[PDB]
Symmetry: C4
């Protein structure tokens, strides 16, 4: 039985080959931004409210035209067959059963149409490719397969410097491939080409500057993910959680504002929502659960997160996610 | 001989079964709010005054119509027979003899009428129950038994996630019961029902938001306890000591403002009073003393705390608790 | 050869009996204020000036009508025969030869007249006693013996709670006595009685509140020492170095403003002067040198401190102590 | 293969004699300013921009009339034959081949004319000497040999207190000499004498006070290096990186503003440029590479730094160094 997300990390570290654990856990450079994602959340404290009606606490949200069971989605994580033989299918089935959106990756190790066929109203994460037409074909494939949003990753003009992977000489095993089939820097022109090619909401993942959040709204984005890519891209990039409040104020409801990086409990979800997030993404912990126990492991993680989110909301006096967004916070020292 | 409260923790850890020590020591979740209660006090420094008349230093206060020997009461702690066979009776006798109020718990392991019969003008802590009538009957029982204040706990719509207890599989031994005999979320309506049912002062324990402190005064509370429940409820809730000054300013004398969480010396009592508290509650250390040496252990703890409070007040130039409330503080780094 | 003051602490720890080392090193309570004296200095960084004339760097100051070779005096430390058989005489001889004022203590283990006969224009530290007439007789004795200033300690209405001493059961050996022969709280009336009884400058040692520094000037003090008594009195009292700049601004040249607590190098002297101190006191390191090597040890400490002060001043562009007081500082993180 | 600058430090520590490693690694006093150079950079986080054109990312700058391949130069480091038998010639050849300026030192262990003959448009670092005419002759020698800038070190009126060197009894081996052949405090008059004696840009290295940066522009300096001399001069001097933004604002383009101290990656270069630096100097890491592998080691270090600078710039949305200077930063906690 798992009682915290950290139990799942310990389980995944036991089972996975070291170099695959390092691919999953690592960040770029000195890993300063990886560590800072955790430090930044640890410094945030919630000011809970008391004595409110909790007859019908609900953790549901409406986002991108669908009800979701929690203010959370599974982050895009490439090559999930690295962690378990059922890879993306195991995670997508558990997310569907939990009512949580799952983000299908451009670098999925099972084709996007197979994962979409699991059901659950999934999203699709796009990398812009040197061949533009391939990127736009991926968007059309995702839409035709029933994906509900395009999560355009805007912080990977190229992959960051992953020193653990370099030191391990890590490469994909022969049995893991990019099943949808290189990176080209995306620009605002690329965003507009995607927006013109689809009716789905376009969500820009990897925004940290306030001006880029404003420009995303002006560009017609339906959402942004405030994110430093889990500390895997620019080493020294500010954590998303440290930019979130300023960004939420600047867009002033013009798009959904998600955040990711280091969310490791329902209490962390509560902190993100109190700082103004519409929802969070969760990356590494979902893969820990997949490595530890496959689909059932992911189901147990999502049940644990749902319990922790409900617990934290009610302890803070919030019968709905909207009420949680109106909580105040205080920075402290750890 | 004990020369600090930390000597009592070491003694209690030696004697108690591990799972009972963990029930006592633990907090919710990652224990971030438990640790932060200590960090927050450690960052506060007092600016002492010199050269004042200390002919007649007194640590007494008047609160809820009674003189108390120190600006301190024993916090409500459930199930004290877990720590010593005399449980609540041992603690209540020592508190009476020291002139300190003792808070009888709804979850006491000796009935509230037995503990009240010890004397000492006790308080009574109320949990709101699914059966409302049971809660209101408890209030009437407490009043009929001579309790002087109703300490309504407002931060437990349900118990937080106590991971040590889950991991230990902790349960009450067969020989410990709730001797007054489930939780229902309390609301402001519950507060009003209690206020209408009693002539005693109603004290809301577990307030952290400034607006909830203001509303408590408007609701007719005679006091509040600024508290995160010793880090046992919302993991990530701000420490009470970090909200205390703002709350004292907002209520501007409209009710007594107590604080708890991490008070471990007379110097900590002085810090709380300099931040504006009327009095503190002390929880875990009283149980350490009870575990270590029963009634005599509690007596020794209260004598040590009285000596440390007198010492700190006089070293800071304060002949009375009111003067201590006018001290200034400075945040520092530890 | 000693190249830092920390070499002397290591040497003194080797030679002294543990309980005497603990009497010297210890503070009150949890030792939070003892540690904070060091943390507070470590957080201060100097902004040095370049390209100034350093033809004739001088570390001298004029204070209380005498030239001193450094902006430093030996702090009052009781019972110096605990550390070396020559006790106060060894320290006073080395201070005289270095041109540094030495503070003779009320609790000296050699009589104040013997120590004054060493020469060197000494100061005299006064404790107010239950028998007032004894305190005023001490002042007259000190003046008749040629002491140049009365350092009235205002932060010891009684001794703080020295837990190391309690735990060690420390007591003075039979061969160490208060050779000038209990504490009574001093008040502003006591200050005025001393000021009326002597022509010497009265320096109030142990001021931390800005208002008490202002009142000291109004009371006719010639100086104050901004100090928490080396963390030995109120545990949780702010470090003097954290109050110094505010106090220097409030008195606006109306008296000399000294500081002590944790000065462990010439660079620390420079930080204190850049924060506005007229001079520092140094306590524990002088006793380390005395324990390690007697008079010659103290001489070596004072020569090392003089070299470090000259080095730091010149590296910061300061040909005089007055120029060092005009340096700016920046708080940083350690 | 080296994947970070820290790999080179480990390699250099293996090969060098301990006392030479300590000469290289050490700082003055307690090494507080040495450590603070790293802490200060670790606290700075970059706010990267996304979706910008990265077709032609260039790391080049124009400085002192020459194009440089990176916003970096090799800092002046005395006596490079201590680290490798080819000393300065090995480093200068690698810097030339990488397109990076190399600063020839007054205390070079190979004559300045030999090092200049390597090519690469070098700079020359000047110490002011007791015999002024020797300093001015050095300037003329450097100019006649083709050096492009005079880097006048203004923070060494004398050498700081290097406790590692004292404790090791470090001295130059007989086979290392000052091949160009004592310190005199330099003043603003010395700066003017140099400016009058040369047509080359004069760069004042070791400025930390804002007023001294302003005065440097007024004095006709072409640049300054904001620097605490790698923590080797005043122990307790603020890190240059903590003064850089204020200094850049005060000079408001009147001279080039470089910074040094603790630059250990391309990400650190990016932080310095986002705080407004025109370029950085790098000291110790260049010597680590020289010790580890001679000229080829330096080449590998400079190739690694070039890759990290390009990577960090592009990940932050910057196609040029000028764009990197317009990035914003946020202080965080580590
Ligand atoms: C192993 C791994 C692979 C990832 N692959 C992608 C990817 O292909 N596309 C993308 O937009 N983000 C990718 N991410 C970033 C995540 O979507 C997410 O931003 C980061 O992991 C969130 O932080 P968390 O892992 O701390 O929860 C990846 C993360 C990891 C750990
Ligand atoms: C073992 C334990 C049981 C407690 N039971 C109750 C309770 O029944 N009702 C309540 O209002 N608080 C309860 N508390 C909270 C305390 O009253 C108090 O808020 C917290 O312990 C104060 O902090 P301290 O222990 O750091 O002094 C309990 C605390 C502990 C440690
Ligand atoms: C062992 C010891 C004894 C002291 N005795 C006295 C005293 O009799 N009177 C007094 O005013 N201060 C006394 N002090 C305080 C010092 O004068 C000084 O304020 C404190 O030691 C300064 O800090 P430092 O030791 O960190 O340099 C004593 C300090 C120590 C360590
Ligand atoms: C061993 C050593 C010798 C140095 N010699 C000189 C020197 O002769 N002249 C000078 O201006 N700076 C000298 N410096 C300072 C460097 O130019 C530079 O300011 C400092 O090393 C920069 O920091 P970094 O080493 O952290 O990169 C020296 C530094 C070291 C480590
Ligand atoms: O973080 C990852 O591993 C990634 O997002 O898939 C990549 F490789 F594109 F950068
Ligand atoms: O902290 C406790 O253990 C408590 O307050 O008694 C409970 F259980 F109600 F939450
Ligand atoms: O700090 C000391 O030991 C003292 O100042 O001498 C005392 F005892 F008076 F408090
Ligand atoms: O830091 C150095 O070692 C130096 O700059 O060369 C010196 F010696 F001049 F101070």
């Amino acid at each position: 039985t798992y009682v915290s997300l950290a139990d799942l990390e310990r389980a995944a570290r036991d089972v996975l080959p070291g170099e695959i654990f390092d691919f999953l856990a690592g960040g770029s450079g000195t890993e300063a931004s990886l560590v800072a994602n955790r430090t930044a959340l640890e410094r945030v404290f919630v000011i809970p409210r008391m004595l409110r009606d909790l007859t019908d606490v609900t953790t549901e949200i409406d986002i991108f035209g669908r009800r979701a069971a929690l203010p959370m989605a599974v982050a895009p994580v490439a090559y999930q067959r690295l962690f378990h033989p059922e890879g993306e299918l195991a995670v997508a089935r558990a997310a569907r059963d939990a009512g949580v959106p799952y983000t299908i990756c451009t670098l999925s190790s099972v084709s996007l149409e197979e994962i979409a066929a699991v059901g659950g109203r999934p999203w699709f994460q796009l990398f812009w490719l040197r061949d533009e037409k391939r990127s736009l074909d991926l968007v059309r494939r995702a839409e035709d397969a029933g994906c509900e949003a395009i999560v355009f990753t805007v912080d990977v003009p190229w992959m960051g410097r992953r020193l653990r992977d370099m030191r391990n000489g890590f490469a994909l095993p022969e049995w893991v491939t990019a099943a949808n089939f290189e990176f080209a820097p995306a620009t605002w022109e690329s965003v507009e080409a995607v927006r013109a090619h689809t009716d789905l909401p376009v969500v820009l993942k990897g925004i940290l500057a306030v001006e880029d959040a404003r420009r995303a709204v002006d560009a017609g984005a339906g959402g942004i993910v405030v994110s430093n890519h889990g500390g895997r891209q620019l080493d020294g990039a500010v954590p998303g959680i440290e930019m979130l409040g300023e960004i939420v104020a600047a867009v002033s409801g013009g798009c959904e504002v998600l955040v990711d990086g280091g969310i490791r409990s329902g209490g962390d979800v509560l902190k993100a929502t109190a700082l103004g997030a519409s929802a969070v993404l969760v990356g590494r912990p979902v893969m820990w659960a997949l490595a530890a126990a496959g689909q059932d492991g992911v189901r147990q993680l999502l049940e644990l997160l749902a319990e922790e989110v409900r617990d934290a909301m009610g302890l803070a006096g919030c019968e709905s996610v909207g009420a949680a967004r109106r909580l105040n916070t205080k920075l402290g020292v750890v």
